[PDB]
Coordinates of C-alpha atoms and ligand atoms in Angstrom, one line a residue:
Chain H
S1 CA -33.8 69.3 -58.9
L2 CA -33.9 65.5 -58.0
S3 CA -30.6 63.7 -57.1
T4 CA -30.1 60.0 -57.7
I5 CA -28.7 57.6 -55.1
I6 CA -27.6 54.2 -56.4
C7 CA -27.1 51.5 -53.8
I8 CA -24.2 49.2 -54.7
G9 CA -22.6 46.5 -52.5
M10 CA -21.7 42.9 -51.9
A11 CA -24.5 40.4 -51.9
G12 CA -26.1 40.2 -48.5
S13 CA -24.5 43.5 -47.3
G14 CA -28.0 44.9 -47.0
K15 CA -28.7 47.0 -50.1
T16 CA -32.4 46.2 -50.2
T17 CA -32.9 46.6 -46.4
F18 CA -31.0 49.9 -46.6
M19 CA -33.3 50.9 -49.4
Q20 CA -36.4 50.1 -47.4
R21 CA -35.1 52.1 -44.4
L22 CA -33.9 55.0 -46.5
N23 CA -37.4 55.1 -48.1
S24 CA -39.2 55.1 -44.7
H25 CA -36.8 57.8 -43.5
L26 CA -37.3 60.0 -46.4
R27 CA -41.1 59.6 -46.2
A28 CA -41.0 60.6 -42.5
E29 CA -39.1 63.7 -43.5
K30 CA -42.0 64.5 -45.9
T31 CA -39.6 64.0 -48.9
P32 CA -40.6 60.6 -50.3
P33 CA -38.3 59.4 -53.1
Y34 CA -38.9 58.0 -56.5
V35 CA -38.0 54.3 -56.1
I36 CA -36.4 52.0 -58.7
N37 CA -35.6 48.3 -58.4
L38 CA -33.1 46.9 -60.8
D39 CA -32.7 43.4 -59.2
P40 CA -34.6 41.1 -61.6
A41 CA -34.0 38.0 -59.4
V42 CA -35.5 39.3 -56.2
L43 CA -38.6 37.5 -54.9
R44 CA -40.5 40.2 -53.1
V45 CA -39.5 43.9 -52.7
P46 CA -40.2 45.1 -49.1
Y47 CA -41.0 48.6 -50.2
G48 CA -43.1 50.3 -53.0
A49 CA -41.1 50.6 -56.3
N50 CA -42.2 53.1 -59.0
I51 CA -40.1 51.3 -61.6
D52 CA -39.4 47.5 -61.2
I53 CA -37.2 45.7 -63.7
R54 CA -39.3 42.6 -62.9
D55 CA -42.4 44.1 -64.5
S56 CA -41.0 44.3 -68.1
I57 CA -38.8 41.3 -67.6
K58 CA -39.7 37.9 -66.1
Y59 CA -36.3 36.6 -64.7
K60 CA -37.1 32.9 -64.7
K61 CA -38.4 33.3 -68.3
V62 CA -35.1 34.8 -69.4
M63 CA -33.2 32.0 -67.7
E64 CA -35.2 29.5 -69.7
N65 CA -35.4 31.3 -73.1
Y66 CA -31.7 32.3 -73.2
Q67 CA -30.3 29.1 -71.6
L68 CA -28.0 30.7 -69.1
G69 CA -27.2 30.5 -65.4
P70 CA -28.0 33.0 -62.5
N71 CA -25.3 35.6 -63.5
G72 CA -26.2 35.4 -67.1
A73 CA -29.9 35.7 -66.6
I74 CA -29.3 38.7 -64.3
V75 CA -27.1 40.4 -66.9
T76 CA -29.6 39.5 -69.7
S77 CA -32.4 41.1 -67.8
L78 CA -30.3 44.2 -67.4
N79 CA -29.6 44.2 -71.1
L80 CA -33.3 44.0 -71.9
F81 CA -34.0 46.8 -69.4
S82 CA -31.2 49.0 -70.7
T83 CA -32.9 48.9 -74.1
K84 CA -35.6 51.2 -72.6
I85 CA -33.2 53.5 -70.6
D86 CA -34.1 56.7 -72.6
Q87 CA -37.7 56.2 -71.7
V88 CA -36.8 55.5 -68.0
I89 CA -34.6 58.6 -67.8
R90 CA -37.4 60.7 -69.3
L91 CA -39.9 59.3 -66.8
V92 CA -37.6 60.3 -63.9
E93 CA -37.1 63.7 -65.6
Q94 CA -40.8 64.3 -65.6
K95 CA -40.8 63.7 -61.9
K96 CA -37.7 65.6 -61.1
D97 CA -39.4 68.5 -59.3
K98 CA -41.9 66.3 -57.4
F99 CA -39.4 64.0 -55.7
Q100 CA -36.3 65.1 -53.8
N101 CA -34.4 61.9 -54.6
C102 CA -34.5 58.9 -56.8
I103 CA -33.2 55.8 -55.0
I104 CA -32.1 52.7 -56.9
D105 CA -31.7 49.1 -55.7
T106 CA -29.4 46.9 -57.8
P107 CA -28.8 43.1 -58.4
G108 CA -27.4 41.2 -55.4
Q109 CA -24.1 40.7 -57.1
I110 CA -22.1 43.8 -57.5
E111 CA -20.3 42.8 -60.8
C112 CA -23.5 42.0 -62.6
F113 CA -24.3 45.7 -62.3
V114 CA -21.0 47.6 -62.5
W115 CA -18.9 45.3 -64.7
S116 CA -21.7 44.6 -67.2
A117 CA -22.0 46.8 -70.3
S118 CA -25.7 47.3 -69.6
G119 CA -25.3 48.2 -65.9
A120 CA -22.6 50.7 -66.9
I121 CA -25.0 52.2 -69.5
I122 CA -27.8 52.5 -66.9
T123 CA -25.4 54.2 -64.5
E124 CA -24.0 56.5 -67.1
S125 CA -27.6 57.5 -68.2
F126 CA -28.5 58.5 -64.7
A127 CA -25.1 60.3 -64.1
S128 CA -25.6 62.2 -67.3
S129 CA -29.1 63.4 -66.4
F130 CA -29.0 64.0 -62.6
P131 CA -26.6 64.5 -59.7
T132 CA -25.9 60.8 -58.9
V133 CA -24.2 59.4 -55.8
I134 CA -23.0 55.8 -55.2
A135 CA -24.0 54.5 -51.7
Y136 CA -21.4 51.7 -51.3
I137 CA -22.9 49.3 -48.8
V138 CA -20.5 47.4 -46.5
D139 CA -21.4 44.3 -44.6
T140 CA -19.7 45.5 -41.4
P141 CA -19.9 42.3 -39.3
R142 CA -18.0 40.5 -42.1
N143 CA -15.2 43.0 -42.5
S144 CA -13.4 42.8 -39.1
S145 CA -10.4 41.1 -40.5
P146 CA -8.0 43.9 -41.7
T147 CA -7.2 42.1 -44.9
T148 CA -10.9 41.5 -45.7
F149 CA -11.6 45.1 -44.9
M150 CA -8.8 46.3 -47.2
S151 CA -9.8 44.1 -50.1
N152 CA -13.3 45.4 -49.8
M153 CA -12.0 48.9 -49.8
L154 CA -9.8 48.3 -52.9
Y155 CA -12.9 47.0 -54.5
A156 CA -14.8 50.2 -53.6
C157 CA -11.9 52.2 -55.1
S158 CA -12.1 50.3 -58.4
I159 CA -15.8 51.1 -58.4
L160 CA -15.2 54.7 -57.7
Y161 CA -12.9 54.9 -60.7
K162 CA -15.1 52.8 -63.0
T163 CA -18.2 54.8 -62.4
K164 CA -16.6 58.3 -62.0
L165 CA -19.3 59.1 -59.4
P166 CA -19.0 60.4 -55.9
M167 CA -19.0 57.6 -53.3
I168 CA -20.4 57.3 -49.8
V169 CA -19.2 54.2 -48.0
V170 CA -21.9 53.0 -45.8
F171 CA -21.0 50.6 -43.0
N172 CA -24.3 48.8 -42.6
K173 CA -25.6 46.6 -39.7
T174 CA -24.1 48.7 -36.8
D175 CA -26.7 47.2 -34.5
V176 CA -24.7 43.9 -34.8
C177 CA -21.2 45.4 -35.2
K178 CA -20.3 49.1 -34.6
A179 CA -18.2 50.8 -37.4
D180 CA -15.8 52.6 -35.0
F181 CA -12.9 50.2 -35.9
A182 CA -13.3 50.9 -39.6
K183 CA -13.7 54.7 -39.3
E184 CA -10.5 54.6 -37.2
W185 CA -8.7 52.4 -39.8
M186 CA -9.6 55.0 -42.5
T187 CA -8.8 57.9 -40.3
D188 CA -5.7 56.9 -38.4
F189 CA -3.7 54.7 -40.7
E190 CA -1.1 53.7 -38.1
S191 CA -4.0 51.8 -36.4
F192 CA -4.6 49.9 -39.6
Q193 CA -0.9 49.2 -39.8
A194 CA -1.0 47.9 -36.3
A195 CA -4.0 45.6 -36.9
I196 CA -2.3 44.3 -40.1
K197 CA 1.0 43.6 -38.3
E198 CA -0.7 41.8 -35.5
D199 CA -3.1 39.8 -37.8
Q200 CA -0.8 39.1 -40.7
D201 CA 2.9 38.3 -41.2
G202 CA 5.6 40.4 -42.5
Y203 CA 5.3 41.4 -46.1
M204 CA 1.7 42.4 -45.8
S205 CA 2.7 45.1 -43.2
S206 CA 5.4 46.4 -45.5
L207 CA 3.0 46.2 -48.5
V208 CA 0.3 48.0 -46.5
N209 CA 3.0 50.6 -45.6
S210 CA 3.4 51.9 -49.1
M211 CA -0.3 51.6 -49.7
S212 CA -0.7 54.0 -46.8
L213 CA -0.2 56.9 -49.1
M214 CA -2.3 55.5 -51.8
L215 CA -5.2 54.5 -49.5
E216 CA -5.1 57.8 -47.8
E217 CA -5.7 59.5 -51.1
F218 CA -8.7 57.1 -51.7
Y219 CA -10.2 57.7 -48.3
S220 CA -10.0 61.5 -48.7
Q221 CA -12.5 61.2 -51.6
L222 CA -15.1 59.3 -49.7
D223 CA -17.7 60.2 -47.3
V224 CA -18.3 57.7 -44.6
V225 CA -21.3 56.8 -42.4
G226 CA -22.4 54.0 -40.1
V227 CA -26.0 52.9 -40.2
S228 CA -28.3 50.3 -39.0
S229 CA -30.9 49.5 -41.7
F230 CA -32.8 47.7 -38.9
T231 CA -33.1 50.6 -36.4
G232 CA -32.7 53.6 -38.8
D233 CA -29.7 54.8 -36.8
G234 CA -27.3 56.9 -38.8
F235 CA -29.6 57.8 -41.8
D236 CA -29.9 61.5 -41.0
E237 CA -26.1 61.5 -41.2
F238 CA -26.2 59.6 -44.5
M239 CA -28.5 62.1 -46.0
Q240 CA -26.1 64.9 -45.0
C241 CA -23.4 62.9 -46.9
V242 CA -25.8 62.8 -49.8
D243 CA -26.2 66.6 -49.8
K244 CA -22.5 67.0 -49.6
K245 CA -21.9 64.6 -52.5
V246 CA -24.6 66.3 -54.6
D247 CA -22.6 69.6 -54.2
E248 CA -19.3 67.9 -55.0
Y249 CA -21.0 66.3 -58.0
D250 CA -22.0 69.7 -59.3
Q251 CA -18.4 71.1 -59.2
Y252 CA -16.1 68.1 -59.7
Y253 CA -18.0 65.3 -61.2
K254 CA -20.6 66.8 -63.7
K255 CA -17.8 67.4 -66.2
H256 CA -17.3 63.6 -66.7
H257 CA -20.9 62.9 -67.9
Chain Z
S1 CA 14.0 57.8 -80.6
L2 CA 14.9 56.8 -77.0
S3 CA 12.3 55.2 -74.6
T4 CA 12.3 55.5 -70.8
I5 CA 12.0 52.5 -68.4
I6 CA 11.2 53.5 -64.8
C7 CA 11.8 50.8 -62.3
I8 CA 9.3 50.8 -59.5
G9 CA 8.6 48.3 -56.8
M10 CA 8.5 47.4 -53.1
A11 CA 11.7 47.9 -51.0
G12 CA 13.9 44.9 -51.4
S13 CA 12.1 43.6 -54.5
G14 CA 15.3 44.1 -56.5
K15 CA 14.9 47.3 -58.4
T16 CA 18.6 48.1 -58.3
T17 CA 19.8 44.6 -59.0
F18 CA 17.3 44.5 -61.9
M19 CA 18.7 47.8 -63.1
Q20 CA 22.3 46.3 -63.0
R21 CA 21.3 43.2 -64.9
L22 CA 19.2 45.2 -67.4
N23 CA 22.2 47.5 -68.0
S24 CA 24.6 44.6 -68.6
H25 CA 22.0 42.9 -70.9
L26 CA 21.5 46.0 -73.0
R27 CA 25.3 46.6 -73.3
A28 CA 25.7 43.0 -74.4
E29 CA 23.2 43.7 -77.1
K30 CA 25.4 46.7 -78.2
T31 CA 22.6 49.0 -77.1
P32 CA 23.9 50.6 -73.8
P33 CA 21.3 52.7 -72.0
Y34 CA 21.4 56.1 -70.5
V35 CA 21.4 55.4 -66.7
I36 CA 19.7 57.5 -64.0
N37 CA 19.6 56.9 -60.3
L38 CA 17.0 58.7 -58.2
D39 CA 17.6 56.9 -54.9
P40 CA 19.3 59.5 -52.7
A41 CA 19.7 57.1 -49.9
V42 CA 21.7 54.3 -51.6
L43 CA 25.2 53.8 -50.4
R44 CA 26.8 52.4 -53.6
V45 CA 25.4 52.0 -57.0
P46 CA 26.4 48.7 -58.6
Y47 CA 26.4 50.1 -62.1
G48 CA 27.6 53.3 -63.8
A49 CA 25.0 56.1 -63.6
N50 CA 25.0 59.0 -66.0
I51 CA 22.8 61.1 -63.7
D52 CA 22.8 60.4 -60.0
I53 CA 20.6 62.3 -57.6
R54 CA 23.3 61.9 -54.9
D55 CA 25.7 64.2 -56.8
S56 CA 23.6 67.3 -56.5
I57 CA 22.1 66.3 -53.2
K58 CA 24.0 65.0 -50.1
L59 CA 12.8 64.6 -40.1
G60 CA 13.5 61.0 -40.7
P61 CA 14.0 58.5 -43.6
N62 CA 11.0 59.2 -45.9
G63 CA 11.2 62.9 -45.2
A64 CA 14.8 63.2 -46.3
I65 CA 14.2 61.0 -49.3
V66 CA 11.2 63.2 -50.4
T67 CA 13.2 66.3 -49.8
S68 CA 16.1 65.1 -51.9
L69 CA 13.5 64.4 -54.6
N70 CA 12.1 67.9 -54.3
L71 CA 15.5 69.5 -54.7
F72 CA 16.2 67.2 -57.7
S73 CA 12.8 68.0 -59.3
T74 CA 13.8 71.7 -59.2
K75 CA 16.2 70.8 -62.1
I76 CA 13.9 68.5 -64.0
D77 CA 13.8 70.7 -67.2
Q78 CA 17.6 70.6 -67.4
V79 CA 17.5 66.8 -66.8
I80 CA 15.0 66.2 -69.6
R81 CA 16.9 68.4 -72.0
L82 CA 20.1 66.4 -71.2
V83 CA 18.3 63.2 -72.0
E84 CA 16.8 64.8 -75.2
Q85 CA 20.3 65.6 -76.4
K86 CA 21.2 61.9 -76.0
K87 CA 17.9 60.6 -77.4
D88 CA 19.5 59.3 -80.7
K89 CA 22.7 58.0 -79.0
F90 CA 20.9 55.6 -76.6
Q91 CA 18.2 53.1 -77.3
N92 CA 16.8 53.4 -73.7
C93 CA 17.0 55.6 -70.6
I94 CA 16.6 53.4 -67.5
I95 CA 15.7 54.9 -64.1
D96 CA 16.2 53.5 -60.6
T97 CA 14.0 54.9 -57.8
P98 CA 14.0 55.2 -54.0
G99 CA 13.7 52.0 -52.1
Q100 CA 10.2 53.0 -50.9
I101 CA 7.6 53.1 -53.6
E102 CA 5.4 55.8 -52.1
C103 CA 8.3 58.2 -51.7
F104 CA 8.4 58.2 -55.5
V105 CA 4.9 57.8 -56.8
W106 CA 2.9 59.4 -54.0
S107 CA 5.1 62.5 -53.6
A108 CA 4.5 65.6 -55.6
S109 CA 8.1 65.7 -56.8
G110 CA 8.2 62.1 -57.8
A111 CA 5.0 62.5 -59.8
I112 CA 6.5 65.7 -61.5
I113 CA 9.6 63.7 -62.4
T114 CA 7.6 60.9 -63.9
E115 CA 5.3 63.3 -65.7
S116 CA 8.2 65.1 -67.2
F117 CA 9.7 61.9 -68.6
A118 CA 6.2 60.7 -69.8
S119 CA 5.7 64.0 -71.6
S120 CA 9.0 63.9 -73.4
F121 CA 9.6 60.2 -74.3
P122 CA 7.7 56.9 -74.5
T123 CA 7.9 55.8 -70.9
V124 CA 7.2 52.4 -69.4
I125 CA 6.8 51.4 -65.7
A126 CA 8.7 48.2 -64.8
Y127 CA 6.8 47.2 -61.7
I128 CA 9.2 44.9 -59.8
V129 CA 7.6 42.1 -57.7
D130 CA 9.5 40.2 -55.0
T131 CA 8.2 36.8 -56.1
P132 CA 9.4 34.7 -53.1
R133 CA 7.4 37.0 -50.8
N134 CA 4.2 36.9 -52.8
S135 CA 3.2 33.2 -52.5
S136 CA 0.3 33.9 -50.2
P137 CA -2.8 34.6 -52.5
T138 CA -3.9 37.6 -50.3
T139 CA -0.4 39.1 -50.3
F140 CA -0.2 38.6 -54.1
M141 CA -3.6 40.3 -54.6
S142 CA -2.8 43.3 -52.3
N143 CA 0.4 43.7 -54.3
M144 CA -1.5 43.6 -57.5
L145 CA -4.1 46.1 -56.3
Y146 CA -1.2 48.3 -55.4
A147 CA 0.2 48.0 -58.9
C148 CA -3.2 48.8 -60.3
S149 CA -3.4 52.0 -58.3
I150 CA 0.1 52.9 -59.6
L151 CA -1.0 52.1 -63.2
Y152 CA -3.9 54.6 -62.7
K153 CA -1.8 57.2 -60.8
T154 CA 0.9 57.4 -63.4
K155 CA -1.2 56.8 -66.6
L156 CA 1.7 54.9 -68.0
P157 CA 2.0 51.4 -69.6
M158 CA 3.0 48.7 -67.0
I159 CA 5.1 45.6 -67.2
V160 CA 4.8 43.4 -64.1
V161 CA 8.2 41.8 -63.5
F162 CA 8.2 38.8 -61.2
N163 CA 11.8 39.1 -60.0
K164 CA 14.1 36.5 -58.3
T165 CA 12.8 33.5 -60.3
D166 CA 16.0 31.7 -59.4
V167 CA 14.6 31.4 -55.9
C168 CA 10.9 31.1 -56.7
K169 CA 9.5 30.5 -60.2
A170 CA 6.6 32.8 -61.3
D171 CA 4.4 30.1 -62.8
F172 CA 1.9 30.2 -60.0
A173 CA 1.4 34.0 -60.4
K174 CA 1.2 33.8 -64.2
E175 CA -1.5 31.2 -63.7
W176 CA -3.3 33.3 -61.1
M177 CA -3.4 36.2 -63.5
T178 CA -4.3 34.0 -66.5
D179 CA -6.7 31.5 -65.1
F180 CA -8.7 33.2 -62.5
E181 CA -10.5 30.1 -61.2
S182 CA -7.1 28.9 -60.0
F183 CA -6.7 32.1 -57.9
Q184 CA -10.2 31.6 -56.5
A185 CA -9.2 28.0 -55.6
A186 CA -6.0 29.2 -53.9
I187 CA -8.0 31.9 -52.0
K188 CA -10.8 29.4 -50.9
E189 CA -8.2 27.0 -49.6
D190 CA -6.0 29.6 -47.9
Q191 CA -8.7 32.0 -46.6
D192 CA -12.2 31.7 -45.2
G193 CA -15.5 32.9 -46.4
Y194 CA -15.9 36.6 -47.0
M195 CA -12.5 36.9 -48.7
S196 CA -13.4 34.2 -51.2
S197 CA -16.8 35.9 -51.8
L198 CA -14.9 39.2 -52.2
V199 CA -12.5 37.7 -54.7
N200 CA -15.4 36.4 -56.8
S201 CA -16.7 39.8 -57.8
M202 CA -13.3 41.2 -58.1
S203 CA -12.7 38.5 -60.7
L204 CA -14.2 40.7 -63.4
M205 CA -12.4 43.8 -62.1
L206 CA -9.0 42.1 -61.8
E207 CA -9.3 40.5 -65.3
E208 CA -9.8 44.0 -66.6
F209 CA -6.6 45.1 -64.8
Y210 CA -4.5 42.1 -65.9
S211 CA -5.4 42.5 -69.6
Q212 CA -3.6 45.9 -69.5
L213 CA -0.4 44.5 -68.2
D214 CA 2.5 42.8 -69.8
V215 CA 4.0 40.1 -67.5
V216 CA 7.5 38.6 -67.3
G217 CA 9.5 36.4 -65.0
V218 CA 13.2 37.3 -64.5
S219 CA 16.1 36.5 -62.4
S220 CA 18.3 39.6 -62.0
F221 CA 21.0 37.2 -60.7
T222 CA 21.2 35.0 -63.8
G223 CA 19.8 37.3 -66.5
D224 CA 17.1 34.8 -67.3
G225 CA 14.0 36.4 -68.8
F226 CA 15.5 39.7 -69.8
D227 CA 15.2 39.2 -73.6
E228 CA 11.5 38.7 -72.9
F229 CA 11.3 41.8 -70.7
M230 CA 12.8 43.9 -73.6
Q231 CA 10.2 42.4 -76.0
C232 CA 7.5 43.6 -73.5
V233 CA 9.2 47.0 -73.5
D234 CA 9.0 47.3 -77.3
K235 CA 5.4 46.3 -77.2
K236 CA 4.6 48.8 -74.5
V237 CA 6.5 51.6 -76.5
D238 CA 4.1 50.8 -79.4
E239 CA 1.0 50.9 -77.2
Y240 CA 2.4 54.1 -75.5
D241 CA 2.4 55.8 -78.9
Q242 CA -1.2 55.0 -79.7
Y243 CA -3.0 54.8 -76.4
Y244 CA -0.9 56.6 -73.8
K245 CA 0.7 59.5 -75.6
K246 CA -2.5 61.5 -75.4
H247 CA -2.4 61.7 -71.6
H248 CA 0.9 63.6 -71.4
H249 CA 1.7 67.2 -72.4
Ligands
GDP301 N1 -28.6 43.2 -38.3 C1 -28.8 43.8 -39.5 N2 -29.1 42.9 -40.5 C2 -29.3 43.4 -41.8 C3 -29.3 44.9 -41.9 N3 -29.5 45.1 -43.3 C4 -29.6 43.9 -43.8 N4 -29.5 42.9 -42.9 C5 -29.6 41.5 -43.2 O1 -28.7 41.0 -44.2 C6 -29.4 40.1 -45.1 C7 -29.2 40.7 -46.5 O2 -29.9 41.9 -46.7 P1 -30.4 42.4 -48.1 O3 -31.2 43.6 -47.9 O4 -31.3 41.4 -48.8 O5 -29.0 42.7 -48.8 P2 -28.6 42.8 -50.4 O6 -28.4 41.5 -51.0 O7 -27.3 43.5 -50.5 O8 -29.7 43.5 -51.2 C8 -30.8 40.1 -44.8 O9 -31.1 38.9 -44.0 C9 -31.0 41.3 -43.9 O10 -32.1 41.3 -42.9 C10 -29.0 45.7 -40.8 O11 -29.0 47.0 -40.9 N5 -28.8 45.1 -39.6
GDP302 N1 17.7 35.3 -56.0 C1 17.6 36.5 -56.4 N2 17.8 37.5 -55.5 C2 17.7 38.8 -55.8 C3 17.4 39.2 -57.2 N3 17.4 40.5 -57.3 C4 17.6 41.0 -56.1 N4 17.9 40.0 -55.2 C5 18.2 40.1 -53.7 O1 17.2 41.0 -53.1 C6 17.9 42.1 -52.7 C7 17.8 43.1 -53.8 O2 17.8 44.4 -53.2 P1 17.7 45.7 -54.2 O3 18.1 45.3 -55.6 O4 18.6 46.8 -53.7 O5 16.2 46.1 -54.1 P2 15.7 47.6 -54.1 O6 15.5 48.2 -52.8 O7 14.3 47.6 -54.8 O8 16.7 48.5 -54.9 C8 19.3 41.7 -52.4 O9 19.3 41.0 -51.1 C9 19.6 40.7 -53.5 O10 20.5 39.7 -53.1 C10 17.2 38.0 -58.2 O11 16.9 38.2 -59.4 N5 17.3 36.8 -57.7
MG303 MG1 -31.5 42.4 -52.0
MG304 MG1 18.3 50.3 -54.6

């Protein structure tokens, strides 16, 4: 019965803080999740994790023993973990009627998780055993430039395609910067064309014009919410987007896994 | 035996000029193509077309274009059969499209037309890039994302064609696609902060996109680069057989 929520997003966008607040929110609803941390580099985890990659794998140690830098040691830790993925999935399976959701925190860097073989295997394993939803975390205060916003959205699209999972775009940190502008840009594309024309010269506008149709087709697939992981604002709405995406998953997405 | 080349690109990038030069180049190689024009809005066509959408077909701009495409797509079976009849008399079928790219690949009728050709012949997308306009790293990247979305939408092999190299050489772009750290450097210099950060993660994603493409620089004015383009076409026809034919029935 359990569904899996995988938090994915740019470093510093708030994945871990979002995870903490989601956890407290679900517990307050008397539906505490099963919590997994897959960031091997993190120093302390500000919530209780049921499975922590750092337990089986000592991140500094893999750095030293394998002689690689940050990105390498993160991906190596993920490889080692992915070795035990069958066991992990079975563990979650045992708990699948005791917990409404399994929620998963990922490495800080998005590409360490979705463009590594091992991260893709981990994701595929979860997708193949439970309804699984990608919560794509957006650092809202940093995406006010229309070109930055659009690049970020193209990236989310590529992730949507790569993972073949339903996506919820989560504009985080609304306590600093509200997400109205972005919702509008995704809803009324002529506003985005206006922002682009003002901000950027010429060809961009024209480019963005054709992309209007393409982007609209992307945005229709998404669910979209604004949250503050500091205040807990918007999380009820996120969980509604989760239930919707679990439904869609059943119909549309289950066939791909 | 014939393969189909569909020219797709931003308005003004040179699709029609590229078609003219490709036509003359192929005729010079004693392998004249079967020529199709699918731009209903064009005033004169600077080459001889075997099938012109304007013949059968005489809101606003994009509405009328898409409507013309609908009407045309009604006769797509006939069109395909016509090309099929000629498939051993012509080495290639080359296709010019509406000025606006979304009129053709994000309309139902344009998608049907493309699917029909993909289902009957090896079909390759020549994605035409207006090189002088894509010197800004962000503009270039947006354009490339767009090409990627097209690659996915059409499920066809893609050749990125940096056109107008007589005005602006395509070295910089080839470099950006080949050596990604150079692109990161161009972005860091040109743009602040979050965009650079963005472009870092995308490095892996974009590398995966670029590895699928073939890439050529041409001048449709001088004919420079077209031999190379046709080599890319042959390569893509091979790939099409193996990898792509399974996605089209
Ligand atoms: N104002 C505000 N700051 C946030 C929020 N979420 C995260 N942050 C801050 O952004 C930084 C990165 O957060 P973190 O949870 O570590 O992001 P992660 O790298 O994606 O896992 C931290 O200093 C957070 O306190 C939020 O909802 N509101
Ligand atoms: N220098 C140069 N200019 C070109 C080339 N190809 C096209 N052009 C110019 O760019 C425009 C081409 O428009 P066109 O071929 O109709 O683009 P379309 O809308 O995609 O069909 C014209 O102004 C041409 O003079 C080229 O290879 N070199
Ligand atoms: Mg974190
Ligand atoms: Mg034209």
